[PDB]
């Protein structure tokens, strides 16, 4: 039950049941970034 979750379950895997009442709008997050330095123009990359 949703009312039975507590400290012992933190960071473990759980299975829960209920009813969806609200979904939000889609957001954007980065998975690969190409960056540059605005002074010396040194370039690199980042991966998520």
């Amino acid at each position: 039950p949703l009312r039975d979750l507590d400290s012992e379950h933190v960071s473990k895997i759980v299975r829960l049941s209920g009813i969806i009442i609200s979904t939000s709008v889609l957001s954007s997050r980065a998975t690969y970034l190409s960056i540059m330095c605005r002074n010396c123009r040194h370039t690199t990359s980042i991966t998520i």
Binding site: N39, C40, T43
Partner: protein, 201 residues
């Protein structure tokens, strides 16, 4: 060099003196060219510093590129890059004009490209250029020290060697057609040896 003071800064001057020490002529990197093996393209970059222009500019310290904009490796093409010659010299007050018993004064002159090896140490020289200051005389940051001032030198554009007695610079005179005609005429007389001999001292 003795009578060159802070009131002549940023103005065009002409100085006389004796060359005391030159420097090794070095190349300066201006444009680099590279190659990417994964794409087959050639790239380049330009470089500049504070002594290549008379007016102050906002610095743009670009780095030397080793990679591509997409991460690929690059290869340097030394034959397609560009280098320019560079030298620095020192000029002192002439020994035949400086006061006796007094330590002398000197000034540095920077030359570039086609005026790079026009004199050797010990010559009497005349250099025309712009007397200019550079950097910050310990003003940026705290820099508690106050003894030093502003670095100064001459960005030269004209160098003239001068002939003197008992020096290594030889005298040469430009010969005009009037002179050539007169010489070739006098060559045809018969006492020319006598005339030329009696003229000495």
């Amino acid at each position: 060099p003795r009578t060159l003071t802070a009131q002549h800064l940023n103005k065009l001057v002409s100085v006389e003196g004796i060359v005391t020490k030159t420097s090794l002529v070095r190349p300066k990197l201006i444009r680099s060219v590279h190659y990417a093996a994964k794409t087959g393209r050639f790239h380049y970059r330009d470089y500049t510093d504070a002594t290549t222009t008379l007016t102050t500019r906002i610095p743009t310290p670009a780095i030397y590129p080793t990679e591509d904009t997409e991460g690929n490796k690059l290869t340097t093409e030394y034959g397609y890059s560009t280098f320019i010659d560079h030298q620095r010299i020192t000029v002192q007050e002439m020994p035949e004009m400086a006061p006796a018993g007094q330590l002398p004064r000197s000034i540095d002159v920077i030359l570039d490209d086609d005026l790079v090896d026009k004199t050797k140490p010990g010559d009497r020289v005349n250099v025309v250029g712009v007397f200019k200051s550079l950097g910050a005389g310990g003003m940026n940051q705290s820099n508690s020290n106050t003894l030093i001032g502003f670095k100064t030198l001459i960005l030269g554009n004209t160098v003239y060697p001068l002939h003197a007695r008992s020096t290594g610079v030889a005298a040469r005179q430009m010969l005009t057609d009037f002179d050539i005609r007169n010489i070739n005429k006098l060559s045809k007389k018969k006492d020319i040896f006598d005339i030329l001999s009696q003229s000495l001292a």
